[PDB]
Structure 1
Amino acid sequence: MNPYARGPNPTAASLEASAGPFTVRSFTVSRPSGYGAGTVYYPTNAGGTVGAIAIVPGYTARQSSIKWWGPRLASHGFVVITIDTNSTLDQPSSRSSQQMAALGQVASLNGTSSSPIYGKVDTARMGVMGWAMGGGGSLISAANNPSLKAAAPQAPWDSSTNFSSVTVPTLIFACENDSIAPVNSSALPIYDSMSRNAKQFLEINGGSHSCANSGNSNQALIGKKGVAWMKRFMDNDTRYSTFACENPNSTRVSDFRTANC
């Protein structure tokens, strides 16, 4: 009787696949509200309203770096907006404001009859993702908006690592050999600061700073985990509890931690 459960029962194979069960379409945002540019990905056949996820790139970067998440997540039953920031050189606090503005605009479009996502979104169920400074921005978003249902930043950085205010379920993807935002001074301290949430830390063996970006060679695992985390926590969908919470016990993972999951 979970009103938010969508799609067939998951399997490892179905979550590792390039595409989930639903057909995906996309469109460009005509007039971004409070951010630079956006692409919205959505399922055409999810069978009920779905939650929305906003995804932000890192410093200097654009939608291309994070775009693979759009179809991957949308095909499992989410509306996903990938953004460009107002400036490629925006810092994490500005990136958080823009991420939240993008979620607001998804809500606007859900109420706009000419939009392809008209009536497709449950605006009460939202999540945040992003790379590097965009990952820091996602954590700021979560700290400031505790009704967000999930966060899953990748290779995050912020000038502070104290995210003890975050009560939103948070999965941190990290990249072992990150030279930009080293794990030991960025992703791991951030993970360790969070005391009141379901949380997880998944470090990719040998990964550079771009190890969770479009074109990575761990899309099966990373995509399984991101989808599972969003499903479990955005949809309250306990079919995904093991996928969300498990240690993959994988040679592709150099460090795994989880708590309250």
Structure 2
Amino acid sequence: NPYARGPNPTAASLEASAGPFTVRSFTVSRPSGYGAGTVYYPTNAGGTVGAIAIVPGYTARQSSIKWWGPRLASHGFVVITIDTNSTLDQPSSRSSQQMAALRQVASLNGTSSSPIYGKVDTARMGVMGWSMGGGGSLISAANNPSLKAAAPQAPWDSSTNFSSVTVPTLIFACENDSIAPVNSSALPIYDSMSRNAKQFLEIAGGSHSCANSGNSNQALIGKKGVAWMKRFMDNDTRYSTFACENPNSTRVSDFRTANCS
């Protein structure tokens, strides 16, 4: 596997705050099609790595999703966290801004002054985000089936029909979400998808922000996020058990999976 990076994973290595790689970050100097961005990158991954774009929810900024930056980058990804043009942008606009963020990562990969010059495999990309940014991630996946993985959290869209999505999709959900109730948002979205590898992980007792920066489940959520992106963006079957397994955890209120390998 030419995309395999880092040592063989363990439960402990994936539950830890930090993966094997050293992480550095920069602010995007001229954001192209979105409000602002922070890029997180491994300094020592030992080969090109895929890119992930992460978008927040309505009223939210990078702080809500920023924990994912170092968490994913430390396992061998270039991660861009964005602010939207407006905190009040809707999911279709969030999707356009997420894809614009991935485009800019590709640009910076070809820019000799950039810290991520030649660090990115621009053919291997992923999408994540919170609530309307989660709905945006699924729109991104529906519109761009060459995306390798999606892992939205507490998603919301005006439509729950993502039957079009062929991208491997992990849905994080929050059991007691009162903003985007699981029964009206996350679970119908999950049930709509019949053509893809998919998973549904609902965090027990979780409020709408159960997968955000400062959550109390970073060990489990981080493990599942990293394993999913490693399995599908890097085709790394060393991660197949971690990616597909029912965690069998008191921290999980609901688990569903399909077409996982």
**C-alpha distance in 2, partners of 1:33/1:170?**
27
Aligned-residue offset at 1:244:
0.2
Aligned-residue offset at 1:73:
0.1
3-state SS in 1 of match to 2:156? coil
Aligned-residue offset at 1:105:
0.1
Displaced runs of 4 or more, over 6 A: none
Residue of structure 1 in register with 2:161 after alignment? 162
Aligned-residue offset at 1:246:
0.2
CA deviations 1:164-186 (Å, max 9, x no partner) are: 00000000000000000000000
Residue of structure 1 in register with 2:249 after alignment? 250
**Structure-to-structure mapping, 1:7-26, within 5 angstroms:** 7-26=6-25
Q: How high is the TM-score relative to the length of structure 2? A: 1.00
**C-alpha distance in 2, partners of 1:248/1:202?**
9
Q: How many residues align?
A: 260
- In the alignment, is residue 31 of structure 1 matched against residue 60 of structure 2? no
3-state SS in 2 of match to 1:114? coil
Aligned-residue offset at 1:188:
0.1
RMSD of aligned residue pairs (Cα, Å): 0.2
Aligned-residue offset at 1:78:
0.1
Aligned-residue offset at 1:134:
0.1
CA deviations 1:121-147 (Å, max 9, x no partner) are: 000000000000000000000000000
CA deviations 1:72-129 (Å, max 9, x no partner) are: 0000000000000000000000000000000000000000000000000000000000
3-state SS in 1 of match to 2:124? strand
**C-alpha distance in 2, partners of 1:41/1:160?**
32
Q: Which runs of 5+ in 2 are unaligned?
A: none
Aligned-residue offset at 1:35:
0.2
CA deviations 1:176-201 (Å, max 9, x no partner) are: 00000000000000000000000000
**C-alpha distance in 1, partners of 2:32/2:223?**
31
3-state SS in 2 of match to 1:230? helix
Q: How high is the TM-score relative to the length of structure 1? A: 1.00
State the identity %.
Answer: 99
3-state SS in 1 of match to 2:199? strand
**C-alpha distance in 1, partners of 2:173/2:150?**
14
